[PDB]
């Protein structure tokens, strides 16, 4: 919990706070798994942020092609099962990127110099210079990812219940 | 350099209001210098090649096998360019295409301080001609081209827009 940031003042709706949120105590029990946990929490949040906007844009845009169209598929919830030639393919290329990640996972912890989640991925240059803004920067990614994990679990489950447009209401 | 340059005569001197000679390096100014030298020589031949081709000078005989020199009796001198056949228009460009090579393939290219474009056919030996009187001629060569660059644009604008040029619109062309 110390050093590794993330618990910050956001009141939970039951009368508790997220100032230090660990109810069942994963920090004190097996703290050697803590770099694996952050690294998990990130990858779940990054993929959920992309899949959130990944449900936004295929309502009104639809990239040119006959295979996916409104007349071809009206319900964007059905793009999973009705485009399987693109499904294995996205799956195939993710497996090339996930495979070069293994040796980073094999020394996840004290052996390799890097902090979990931290690819050397900054083409545009937007990660700031000093800790005061950098810790604030890493914290904003955590909450946006966590807001997006719970989001798409409500978006996708909503569309099976309601069967409606984009704000589901 | 800007100074000691042929092309700077009495009535204007250094004519550069928008400061274009300063705009690049020395190699930049040498490119513009032989551009204006080449823009002149094309326009001097086209202005003079407009005045005749309009008064009926008329090479005797046949230009090609069936498209002989009837191109001067009726059509304007801006025309008779599609009347010249393709194989005739082709050898014109390719003699030019050859002439642009010796111009470029000298021992020292002129933006590196080398000589200006010289004659391809019949070189002889050149401006071993008394460099005081050489400077007077290169002023005479460029000024006639300056006047001809304006004049060939007058001849085009008269052929497109009637009445675009006052004491020149009453001329059959």
């Amino acid at each position: 919990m110390v050093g590794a940031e993330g618990p910050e003042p956001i009141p939970f709706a039951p009368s508790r706070t997220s100032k230090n949120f660990d109810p069942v105590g994963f920090a004190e029990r097996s703290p050697e798994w803590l770099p694996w946990y952050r690294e998990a929490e990130l990858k779940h949040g990054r993929a959920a942020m992309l899949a959130t906007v990944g449900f936004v844009v295929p309502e009104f845009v639809r990239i040119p092609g006959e295979q996916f169209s409104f007349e071809a598929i009206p319900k964007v919830i059905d793009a999973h099962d009705a485009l399987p030639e693109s499904m294995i393919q996205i799956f195939g290329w993710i497996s090339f990127l996930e495979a070069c990640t293994f040796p980073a996972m094999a020394g996840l912890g004290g052996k390799y110099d890097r902090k979990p989640g931290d690819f050397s991925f900054d083409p545009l240059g937007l990660y700031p210079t000093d800790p005061e803004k950098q810790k604030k920067m890493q914290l904003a990614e955590l909450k946006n990812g966590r807001l997006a994990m719970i989001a798409i679990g409500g978006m996708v489950t909503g569309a099976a219940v309601t069967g409606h447009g984009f704000p589901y209401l | 350099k800007v100074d000691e340059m042929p092309g700077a005569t009495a009535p204007l001197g250094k004519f550069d209001p928008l400061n274009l000679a300063t705009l690049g390096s020395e190699s930049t100014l040498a490119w513009f210098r032989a551009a204006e030298l080449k823009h002149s020589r094309v326009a001097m031949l086209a202005t003079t090649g407009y005045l005749v081709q309009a008064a009926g000078i008329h090479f005797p005989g046949m230009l090609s096998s069936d498209v002989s020199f009837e191109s001067l009796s009726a059509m304007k001198p801006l025309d008779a360019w599609d009347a010249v056949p393709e194989g005739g228009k082709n050898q014109i460009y390719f003699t030019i295409f050859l002439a642009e090579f010796i111009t470029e393939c000298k021992g020292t290219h002129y933006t590196k301080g080398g000589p200006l474009p010289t004659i391809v056919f019949p070189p002889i030996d050149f401006s071993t001609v008394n460099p005081e009187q050489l400077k007077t001629r290169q002023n005479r060569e460029l000024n006639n081209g300056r006047l001809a660059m304006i004049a060939i644009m007058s001849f085009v604008a008269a052929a497109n827009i009637p009445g675009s040029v006052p004491a020149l619109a009453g001329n059959p062309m």
Binding site: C100, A104, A106, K111, Y112, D113, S120 | -
Partner: protein, 214 residues
């Protein structure tokens, strides 16, 4: 798990690879070889096995090739074959204007319309079987050197044969040689993927056999 891990003797946890900056650099990669950006995400250079064992078995005598050396020697041979094979596949198809074919009726357009059916057609005839023997002689006369270098008795670079008949590089500065060597590798790399492209498309359900194979 309580021995000393194998991840440490082959991973070098101090520097990072130029390619993929989040992985650390493999121990045998340097900047020394031409065409090197530290790219080895699967840590193949780091495998501590003697791959000269395939030619000569390890039980013959004490001996060891560096793993990195055997890889470079492979990659050069994979480069050379693919540069010629991609070029030779298109040239017999008429992709460069002229349909280049050997004299004689057997290798003409009427018996073989395009290169896609040249392997199976020439295999039955025998011209394919003949080239197998002709390569076989060269491979055997050139693969024995790998043994010498593995015994430490040679100072020859990987893929280096005194084949410079036009003397491209005699008396060139090591900067000039290294740059030229990088060209063998970069053009070879592009041609390994070019041949893999052409051979794959041309074998699916659609796909033509014209110069463009899409």
């Amino acid at each position: 798990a309580m021995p000393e891990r194998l991840w440490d003797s082959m991973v070098d946890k101090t520097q990072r690879s130029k390619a993929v900056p989040f992985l650390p650099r493999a121990v045998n990669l340097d900047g020394s070889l031409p065409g090197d950006v530290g790219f080895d995400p699967f840590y193949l250079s780091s495998i501590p096995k003697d791959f000269s064992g395939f030619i000569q078995p390890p039980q013959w005598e004490e001996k060891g090739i560096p793993t990195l050396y055997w890889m470079r020697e492979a990659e050069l041979k994979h480069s050379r074959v693919a540069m010629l094979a991609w070029f030779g596949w298109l040239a017999t198809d008429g992709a460069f204007g002229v349909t280049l074919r050997f004299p004689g009726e057997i290798y003409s357009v009427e018996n073989i319309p395009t290169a896609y059916e040249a392997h199976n057609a020439l295999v039955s005839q025998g011209s394919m079987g003949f080239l197998l023997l002709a390569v076989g002689f060269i491979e055997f006369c050139t693969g024995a050197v790998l043994v010498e270098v593995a015994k430490g008795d040679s100072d020859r670079e990987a893929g280096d044969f005194k084949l410079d008949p036009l003397s491209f590089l005699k008396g060139k500065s090591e900067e000039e040689i290294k740059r030229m060597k990088t060209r063998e590798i970069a053009n070879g790399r592009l041609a390994m993927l070019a041949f893999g492209g052409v051979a794959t498309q041309t074998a699916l359900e659609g796909g033509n056999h014209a110069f463009p194979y899409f």
